[PDB]
Symmetry: D2
Subunit: 393 residues, 4 copies
Amino acid sequence: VQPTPADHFTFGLWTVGWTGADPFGVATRANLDPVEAVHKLAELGAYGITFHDNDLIPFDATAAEREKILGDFNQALADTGLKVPMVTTNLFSHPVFKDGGFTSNDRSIRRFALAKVLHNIDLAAEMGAETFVMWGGREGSEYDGSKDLAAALDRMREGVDTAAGYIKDKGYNLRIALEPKPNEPRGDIFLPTVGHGLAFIEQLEHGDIVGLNPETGHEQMAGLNFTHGIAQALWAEKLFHIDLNGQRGIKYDQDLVFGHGDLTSAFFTVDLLENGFPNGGPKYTGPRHFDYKPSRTDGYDGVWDSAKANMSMYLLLKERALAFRADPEVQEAMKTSGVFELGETTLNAGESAADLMNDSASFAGFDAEAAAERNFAFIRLNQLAIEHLLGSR
Amino acid sequence: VQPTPADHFTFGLWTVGWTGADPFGVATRANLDPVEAVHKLAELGAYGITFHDNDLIPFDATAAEREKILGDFNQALADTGLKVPMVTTNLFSHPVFKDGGFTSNDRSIRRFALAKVLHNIDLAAEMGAETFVMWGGREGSEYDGSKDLAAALDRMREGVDTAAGYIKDKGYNLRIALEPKPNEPRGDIFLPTVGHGLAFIEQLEHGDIVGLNPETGHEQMAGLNFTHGIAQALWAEKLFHIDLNGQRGIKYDQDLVFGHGDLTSAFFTVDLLENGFPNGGPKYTGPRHFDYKPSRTDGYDGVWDSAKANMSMYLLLKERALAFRADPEVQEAMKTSGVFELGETTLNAGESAADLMNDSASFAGFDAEAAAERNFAFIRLNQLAIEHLLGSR
Amino acid sequence: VQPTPADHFTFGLWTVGWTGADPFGVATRANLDPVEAVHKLAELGAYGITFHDNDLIPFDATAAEREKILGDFNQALADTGLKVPMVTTNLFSHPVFKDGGFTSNDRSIRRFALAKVLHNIDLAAEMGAETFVMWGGREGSEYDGSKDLAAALDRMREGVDTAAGYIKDKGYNLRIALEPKPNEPRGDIFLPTVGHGLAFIEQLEHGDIVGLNPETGHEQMAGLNFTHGIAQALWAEKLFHIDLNGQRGIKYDQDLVFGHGDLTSAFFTVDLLENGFPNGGPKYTGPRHFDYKPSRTDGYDGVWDSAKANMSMYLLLKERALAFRADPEVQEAMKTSGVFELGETTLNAGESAADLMNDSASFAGFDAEAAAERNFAFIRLNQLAIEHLLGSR
Amino acid sequence: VQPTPADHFTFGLWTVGWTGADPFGVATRANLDPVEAVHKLAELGAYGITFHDNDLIPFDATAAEREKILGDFNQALADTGLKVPMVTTNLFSHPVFKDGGFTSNDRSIRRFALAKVLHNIDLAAEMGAETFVMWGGREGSEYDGSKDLAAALDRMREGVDTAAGYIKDKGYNLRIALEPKPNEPRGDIFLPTVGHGLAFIEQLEHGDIVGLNPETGHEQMAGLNFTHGIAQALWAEKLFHIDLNGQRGIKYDQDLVFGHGDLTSAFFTVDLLENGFPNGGPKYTGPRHFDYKPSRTDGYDGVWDSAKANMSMYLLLKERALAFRADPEVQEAMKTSGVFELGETTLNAGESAADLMNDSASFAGFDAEAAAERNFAFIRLNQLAIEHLLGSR
Ligand SMILES: OC[C@@H](O)[C@H](O)[C@@H](O)CO
Ligand SMILES: OC[C@@H](O)[C@H](O)[C@@H](O)CO
Ligand SMILES: OC[C@@H](O)[C@H](O)[C@@H](O)CO
Ligand SMILES: OC[C@@H](O)[C@H](O)[C@@H](O)CO
Ligand SMILES: [Mg+2]
Ligand SMILES: [Mg+2]
Ligand SMILES: [Mg+2]
Ligand SMILES: [Mg+2]
């Protein structure tokens, strides 16, 4: 299994550049030069790279400094052939963002935050990014009385709609992808799950160009089914981007390599990305982006091993998911379990409520005890899927 | 503290009628006669009662039997003065619903399920119910390959839109309230949280009369902030009903008395229901419905004690939440923390993106280190709230 | 990868006999006869069967019927050759056990529960069981003031030590195994995890014959590492029996097939039972017991599929972990990461604390920053196990 | 409800000195001088202060500087009268401890870590500490094959017993207290809950002087009942110190003020430390230590508010639990529910197992169905505690 640029594996600069500082310790690794990250990822098989404005250009950087850094980074891009599919803003590390960016209680800070995003749209547009991600990690609270909850969502709408309006005004081919997370760093974050993000988008003035960026570990931190959430995002045609990593349970965000967390759930996520829905439906077409952190125990040899593991994991799952659905044994098991039956509409062509309530076959003379005897055989179909994942089939 | 019918405390027949059977044991209590439940709840101070079609009318009941049961139950209602604000359908206890009602893989079962709901709308309309709740508890899976996830949501939309269309056709004053739950009885349930429910409603043909019925313990089973979720439902004006109970953590659904689970979260939920948003916004106006289960350890003396505890808990929280917001000390603390500041729009009247990006005060000459010095004093405001809850203030 | 009696795969009569009632529904399958259970399990390759007293002998049976059911049961064991390695008592279904068996607040229920256990030890010895399991499912509370916590533990001690002394007194060749569970059906169960259960055994009078009976899903309900937990039971030489199944997250007890929950942890679980410790130490030589429940969506064909599936899953995993450890590239990776290094004692033969303190190269002259540079290469080691698991190596 | 030195409220130098860096951001407050820390804590009513070696003495300090910082530190203790009841070692921040202290895979880090601890025991004795705490924060793994689990426990044993033997050898009047934590910063920490820690102490050579140091939030991260856990530590007479704070659910370690997390459980926690057991038994007479972190949104005024808040919270709760138990209606409710009944032994003075077995009224002639009718009245008992807690009784 070898990743080729056609696989569309993208990595953020902060992923392999994650230095190791956590809540109980300092960094264990030296800073990564951005120029080296670009060359290194291109040798491993990356398609692209992504970044936060402050991953690249320091918060306090002067003008002279900004142009050097960009000169150096466009050089590298040109030399290697890597693309920049997504760009994001850091509205969480500086102490100024302690209560949030867009939903800070201080109005002057909300204004700085939105200014910092607008300037960043320009840069994203100049880099040729298709997607603009917003992760509001400081948007929320520890305490329930800290916020006016309706005001927090109005403030949130103000900023996303101003950023969308500007995109439209400037003529840029960028779509905004919002990224939900339940907790960490705040005790509770606003728009905690895929569902909250999707609901919020519908209340937006310019929601037409606003969609989601779900992350595997983030949905797993609330104990949800990551494959079920992306399937609701796909169905509403709002799956604009995706962040892939691993998580081993409800606890702090681990950011492990994709496949190094819940393995069967990873298998089924690859299946949906690659095979789509069993009865047909929309298909995800974008970057396969890995937002993980090489464990702090490992040196730089581990950093490039970890980057590699992400694409290997993904290609190994892909080989198994294609084989799985290709197996005639699996196709038969699927039909038996009613997987294609689910796709037939419940009512008949031009049948109304009234029409169905009256049908005696459907209700009054329906033999419920008889219908309850069907052996759905879900266990057998799940055993078949695991045997294809373990490659023993 | 005494509940008066003006408090609008409603109870389901299955709550106080919950008999005690759980996964490792049989019932510890005898069945509750519905006639007695109605008299008993009226003596305790209830405003109303709610039920599932099969709580009242048995699955196999004959026609003669159906009329006796309804004759008996309308008599009781007439005698006591209790109202029926909500009615729901049982699409989960009979073995026929083992794979769901609306999203069963078997098409004949989907048809029976929808027939069973349509007939139930009629009954709800005849009882004078304002709300029709749908809790799809068997909608989901244990295994990731069991379902065509897009087909599952299409099937789900079919049934809710057919039920809504019929309401409209018949002229009934009923709104549908969907009720999310992450898991139990299925390993994963479709539309797991408030956010998923809200997102789904937006894809509906007749979503105008479809809203939510959040339950305290259900959002807490995913570790979410129940007050934050109802605040997103309120903001989108989709909070049609509410189920109040307690839950002590991420585990099986406990259905404890309201206030017998996370106490501070209960305080803040009462605050939002009774005081609304600090800067103004929509207010919830419906029944305060308790969907709990009197612990199986307790006899019928405990059943009526438990029903009573629900309304006492609620009135005790209400007394404290009104006092809390009335305290001048709290009002000052709120302003200091920026709670009213959050309500001022971020941009100025007729200010555009461009206009803000250019403002030098807002970005380029913004002193971020200076702004980061503000002491939000969230801890102090949270200490003030707890002292009002403990009534030591 | 056909199990054979040599494999020591045991199954409980209540697993395959589980008819499907969950908290929101009734059974979906017909009762399973125990004679049918023995013949069917023996044709699939099981080595033995386990049961709870009331799984075979009804709570109400007269002596006549007890002896009648036992004769057909022993006949069936005789005809097939299944052994009966473990026996347990039901101290949870009947309404009398609503507050517990051994720790019921009511003294007359504690005596009845203890008498129930003592007569069950006589049947255990009669059957040839080597292990007598105690899962205290109703020992706990929903509310914190429901119990005196010190007295609850004196009452658990008194029952376990009384049962242990009787074993010793009659000269039975039996060991008691406790089974920890965090919750379900009590809100909080006493002795909730493997650790609690090991600590408790150290306060017993008859501790020498008391060990543990850990269950996969039970530790996963508290978010703990199942492999770490049994490691700790094994290291203390208290792993006397084991219950294997699947669980997908912190939620209600799912009891899936082993391998249908956290797959990667199942792999590492099989690795420790099968291979033991890398540097050598204790090993678990007991039966491999499956304590699961066939999903309720499935007929009797799914029941036997499910039972097959347990055995397959364990042999598939078994094979990959033998190949994993035999692999020369894995053994070198292990060496690099320090797995064998941890095997060496920290202090030198004869080195005292005073000695180590005084060794300038261990402390005053140690280069803490040079030592921090080591690449432990845990990501690569982890990536090697997963390729062995996916059957790619 | 003004704390006074008599109350035994202790605070760590790292709590109030916690500057705010979390995983997505830098400090938001200036460093706090330790002399300032002692004076400020002494004006608020603290009885003592605790610290980690590196909280006071930098990792790099020369001997000259160590002695210089200690002289100003002891001066400040002298001027104020604060005691120093517990001392601990930092075996987690420096990059060298990336795989652990005592259980690092690297042997030279195990020796360096142990030497670090041994010299810290000399400082502990010098200060007048009675307790030496060990939180093994980096002892664990992210991946299951990273460690040999039996060897990890031999290496934890060897370090704890070496430290214990040295204490005994020097005649220091010190006790070691272990502090369990399920995760954060390792994916899985060794000795994850109170039980694991108690079981482990029973395999030690020097067990007699080793006890526990449970922390509220740490058990709440595994979803366990904090009151049940310390009950079990207390019952085994292993509760040697206690760390109190707040946690709102299974998620990252929040370290809130005690009482700002699970309020009802805090009440019951205060009830056991303060009142002990209803039928009598052990009592915890040690210091009440607050191991928390002032939220990063707040200035230095919030830091002192937060510290005040800990003490207030505990005295408010203290008052309500003294009133709760003194109340004649609560004592009658306790009697009805069987709280004192559980205090009586199950067997009669002199009754043997054979005797109980043979008593027809305890088993053969027992009316299990009449006994199942008892109303335990646990809901009312629970409702009485909450009205005492809300200060309504
Ligand atoms: O939880 C942290 C988030 O996952 C970020 O890495 C974003 O994806 C981009 O700000
Ligand atoms: O989890 C069970 C649900 O809460 C039901 O009680 C509904 O509210 C109505 O079907
Ligand atoms: O959660 C249920 C427990 O696992 C029981 O099945 C015991 O193993 C047998 O009483
Ligand atoms: O989670 C962190 C632990 O609580 C530590 O603060 C120990 O108590 C002291 O090393
Ligand atoms: Mg992300
Ligand atoms: Mg409900
Ligand atoms: Mg079991
Ligand atoms: Mg601590």
